[PDB]
Amino acid sequence: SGSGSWQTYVDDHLMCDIEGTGQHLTSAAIFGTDGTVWAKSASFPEFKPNEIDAIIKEFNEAGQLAPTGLFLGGAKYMVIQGEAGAVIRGKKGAGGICIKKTGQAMVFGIYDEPVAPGQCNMVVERLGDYLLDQGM
Template sequence: AILGQDGSVWAQSSAFPQLKPEEIEGIKKDFEEPGHLAPTGLFLGGSKYMVVQGEGGAVIRGKKGPGGVTIKKTTQALIFGIYDEPMTGGQCNLVVER
């Protein structure tokens, strides 16, 4: 999915979860203050992801079971990639972060 930094949806697949306003705010705050989501976890559509090492201010990564999420911040948008087996976190990172 691609969201504007204001949280507006620019494009998303049919399987992408419906994000809640507070989830978007938490993601935006973590880009401003890296580590903000680490104690509570990253939530997308009510599903909790454990925050794993990303790149402060640029990339947030989360794990949930065998899958996870990569969120890349660009100058105008937030790019989301959610993956599950057989895709790996490394493969998702390559696609989202390009």
């Protein structure tokens, strides 16, 4: 028994096997809307505050990141179609990133083949909607 852990949602809802494919996200994390990390998986990249701030900016006003690309841990993802104030998506070859904004949080998923883009989107959006339903 403990008082709870954001790591529980990272391991059990983001890093779990996806729909009986036997495949999972490479890494995942939950951040506060201010850019503080609440929990991140064992392989999540070495992100730096400027990268998170750039992502916060993009949620506040879409179309800022795409001319430059999305940096996280030094790696460059090309920005693809998202949803203003809700979802930011990035591509790097057959991998990518998906970020879902909630009231109080941002949920990150990073994937590589054979995980499809839609599956990252699905995993991160399902957790984000659950947090939204709880007023977070």
